Amino acid sequence: MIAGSMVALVTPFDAQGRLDWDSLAKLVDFHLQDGTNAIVAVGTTGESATLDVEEHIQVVRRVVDQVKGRIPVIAGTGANSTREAVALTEAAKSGGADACLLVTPYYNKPTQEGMYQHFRHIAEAVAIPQILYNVPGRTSCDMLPETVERLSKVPNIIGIKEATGDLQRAKEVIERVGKDFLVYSGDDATAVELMLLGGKGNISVTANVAPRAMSDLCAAAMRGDAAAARAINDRLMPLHKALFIESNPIPVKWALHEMGLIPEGIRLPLTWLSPHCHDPLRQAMRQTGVLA
Amino acid sequence: MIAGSMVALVTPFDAQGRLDWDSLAKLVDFHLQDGTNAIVAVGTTGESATLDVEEHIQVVRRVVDQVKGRIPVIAGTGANSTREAVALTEAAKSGGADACLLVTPYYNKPTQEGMYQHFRHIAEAVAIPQILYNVPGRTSCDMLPETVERLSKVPNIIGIKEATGDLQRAKEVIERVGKDFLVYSGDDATAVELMLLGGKGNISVTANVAPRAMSDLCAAAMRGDAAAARAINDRLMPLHKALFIESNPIPVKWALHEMGLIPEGIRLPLTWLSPHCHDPLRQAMRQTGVLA
C-alpha cells in the first residue's frame, strides 16, 4: 500500500544552518504535484544524523501537516541504541507519520540475533508500521536475508529498504518473504531491476531532482514493461551516478540549489559539493533534462 | 602523560539494564592495581552507543574520582554530528577527564575535507587534548593519512587511535606526523609492532581481562625490546582473537563476568555471548592463565 516512487527527502538549511520551512514546503508541493508516491522525511538523505530530537519531530509534523493525508509520510527513526529508537519512533508516531523507516544499528555491529531482538522490540513497543533498512556500506553491519525472513513474520513490520544494490540479495529476500511483505530498493541505479524481480518501489534519491521521471520508471517496471523501464533507467543513469559522486546527500543538495529549490546549507561533518564535481553533475542534470 | 597500556573500559550493567557502580569501582581498582596506564571510559568498548547523556558523565566522573588522578582518564565523546561531538566533549572536560577520544563520523560518511572541518571545530571549542580514533571497520569511513597529517597540526589534537590493523598505514602516519603527535594502537593483535615502529600505546580491549600482561607488553615494546614484546603477545594471541569471536564488546563483557568482575548485562542491540562461542572463549582464558 506504500509503493512506487518514494522520495528520500532532503532537509533544507539556510547558509547559517537553520532549517528553511519555506523550502521544505516547496519540496513537498513539488513532489506532491509531480506524483511521488510517498515522502521519507529524516532519512540518510534528510541528514538524520545531525538534527535535534526536537528538530526531527518538528520536521515530520510540518510535512505531515502539509501532505494532509494525501500520500504516505514515512519517517526515518533508526538509532543504534534500541531505546533511542523506540524514542524516535514514538515521536514520529506522535507526529502523525504513517510508518517508520528503521536502519540497522550503525557502528555498533550487532549480531544477526541482536538485530532481530532490536527490531522486534521496537515493533512490539510502538504501534506503527515499520520498514526495515539494510545498507551495509554505511552501517558496517549487515542484515542477512535469513534474518529479514524471521522479521517478516512480526506484526507491524511490513517491508525492507534493501540498499546493498546486490541483485542476488534481492532475488533472495523476495524469495524468502510473503507477498504482503514489501521489498524496496535503496539503490537508485539498480532499482529498476529489483522491481522487475518482484520489488514494490524505490525509496529514491534521484526522485528529489526528477520526481516525474521516477514515477514513470517505477510504474513501467511494476507493470512488466521491462523494455520501457530499462529504457527510462538507461536515460537516467548519468544522473544516478552523478548524485553519488561524493557521499550522499552532498551531491543532491547542490542539484536542488541549482534548481532553486533549496538554499546552500548543509550541516557538518558534511560539506558542500567540492568544486571539481560541479560540471560533471551540472552536465548530468542537463544531459537528462532537469536543467537547461 | 598519555602512553602505554590503556584499557578501553567496559561499563557494567546489572541484569535489568542499570549501571552497577560497585562493579565499575571494582574494575577501576583492578586496573589501578595490575598496572594499567590509563583508562578509556565510555568508549566503543564502554558501550557508549546505548548510554544516556546523564549516564555518560555520571561515569567519567566516577572513574576520575576513584583514580585519585593516579592515572589519566580518557573519555569517548565522538559523535557523527559536529554538534553533539562538541557537547559530549564539553561534558568530559567538566567531569574531569584529561583528554578525549573521538571517533571519525560513522554512518554519514564524510568527505576527507569534512572530517578535517569536523575535528578542527571541536578542537577550537573545547580546550582539552583530543585523540583521533580511526576505524573504518565500524564507521564505513576511512580517514586517510593526508587528513591525519593535516589535523595533527591542530592545537589541542594530540594523537590518533589507529584500528585498521594495517601496519603499513601506521608507518606512513608516523612518517607524516610530528615527533610530538602520538599514534596509538586500536588493533590488539598488531599493537606490539605498531609500537615497535614508533607507537606510543595501545588502547586495548584484551587489557580488560589481562591488564598486567598488557602493561608489560607495552613496556617491552616502547623500549624497543621486541624480543620480549612478542613473547607476551604470543601467549596472549589466543585471547586477542577470542575477544572478537563476536563483535566487541560482547565477548569481553562475558569474560569479565566469568572472572566474577561484572554482572551479566548488556544493552540492546548488543546481545549476550551466543552459547556457540562459549567453549571457544572459555578455553582461551584458560590457555591464557586468566582462568583455570
DSSP line for chain A: ---EEEEE----B-TTS-B-HHHHHHHHHHHHHHT-SEEEESSTTTTGGGS-HHHHHHHHHHHHHHHTTSS-EEEE---SSHHHHHHHHHHHHTTT-SEEEEE--TTT---HHHHHHHHHHHHHHS-S-EEEEE-HHHHS----HHHHHHHHTSTTEEEEEE-S--HHHHHHHHHHS-TTSEEEE--TTTHHHHHHTT--EEEESGGGT-HHHHHHHHHHHHHT-HHHHHHHHHHHHHHHHHTTSSSTTHHHHHHHHHTTSS-S---TTS----GGGHHHHHHHHHHTTS--
Residue B203 in marked binding region: yes
CA atoms of B183 and B145, how far apart (whole Å): 12
Residue in B49, B80, B114 closest to A271 by CB: B114
Catalytic residue among B161, B184, B200, B253, which?
A: B161
| Binding-site residues on chain B for chain A (CB distance < 8 A) | 44, 49-51, 80-83, 103, 105-111, 113-115, 117-118, 121, 136-140, 246-248, 250, 267-271, 274
Taking alpha carbons only, the member of A258, A254, A248 closest to residue A290 is: A258
Residue B85 near residue A50 (C-beta atoms within 8 A): no
Active site residue B184: no
Residue B45 in marked binding region: yes
**Rounded (10°) CA dihedral B266, B271, B276, B281:** -40
Q: How far lies A199's CA from each of A153, A219, A221, A239, in Å? A: 18, 12, 9, 22
**For chain B, after which residues does the C atom lie more than 2.5 Å from the next written residue's N, i.e. where is it broken?**
none
Q: In three state form, how does the secondary structure of A12-37 look? A: CECCCCCECHHHHHHHHHHHHHHCCC
Residue type at position B113 = E
Please give the span between the terminal C-alpha atoms of chain B, in angstroms, as a whole number. 36
Resolution of the coordinates in A?
Answer: 2.8
Residue in A110, A113, A117 closest to B274 by CB: A113
Binding-site positions of A for pyruvate read: 45, 203
DSSP code of B143? -
Taking alpha carbons only, the member of B135, B164, B132 closest to residue B148 is: B132
> Mutate which of A121, A124, A270 to test chain B, going by most B C-beta atoms within 10 A?
A270
Q: Do B268 and A109 touch (CB under 8 A)?
A: no
- The beta strands (E) that lie in chain B are given as 4-8, 38-41, 73-76, 99-103, 130-134, 157-162, 182-185, 201-204
Q: Is the dihedral of CA A187, A188, A191, A193 positive or negative?
A: negative
Q: How far lies B218's CA from each of A107, B161, B172, B223, B259, in Å? A: 28, 15, 21, 8, 23
Residue B59 near residue B24 (C-beta atoms within 8 A): yes
What residues of A are labeled active site? 133, 161
Closest residue in chain A to residue B266, using alpha carbons only: A114
CA atoms of B18 and B12, how far apart (whole Å): 8
* Chain B residues close to A270, C-beta within 8 Å: 108, 110-111, 114
At B134, give phi and psi (nearest 5°): -115, 135
* Chain B residues close to A271, C-beta within 8 Å: 110-111, 113-114, 117
Taking alpha carbons only, the member of A35, A8, A4 closest to residue A199 is: A4
Closest residue in chain A to residue B273, using alpha carbons only: A111
CA atoms of B269 and A116, how far apart (whole Å): 9
Give the residue numbers spanning the domain of B68: 1-292
Q: Do B110 and A270 touch (CB under 8 A)?
A: yes
Q: Do B118 and A269 touch (CB under 8 A)?
A: yes
CA atoms of A50 and B85, how far apart (whole Å): 11
Overall number of domains in chain A: 1
* Chain B residues close to A268, C-beta within 8 Å: 81-82, 114, 117-118, 121
Q: Are strands A157-162 and A130-134 parallel, antiparallel or unpaired?
A: parallel
Shortest Cα distance, chain B CAs vs residue A270, angstroms: 5
Q: What's the CATH number where A5 sits?
A: 3.20.20.70
Residue A42 near residue A60 (C-beta atoms within 8 A): yes
Please give the span between the terminal C-alpha atoms of chain A, in angstroms, as a whole number. 36
Shortest Cα distance, chain A CAs vs residue B222, angstroms: 31
CA atoms of A35 and A50, how far apart (whole Å): 29
B154, with CB counted inside 10 A (0-12, 13-18, 19+), is: middle
A180, with CB counted inside 10 A (0-12, 13-18, 19+), is: exposed
Binding-site positions of A read: 45, 203
CA atoms of B292 and B283, how far apart (whole Å): 9
Q: Do B274 and A81 touch (CB under 8 A)?
A: no
Q: Do A82 and B107 touch (CB under 8 A)?
A: no
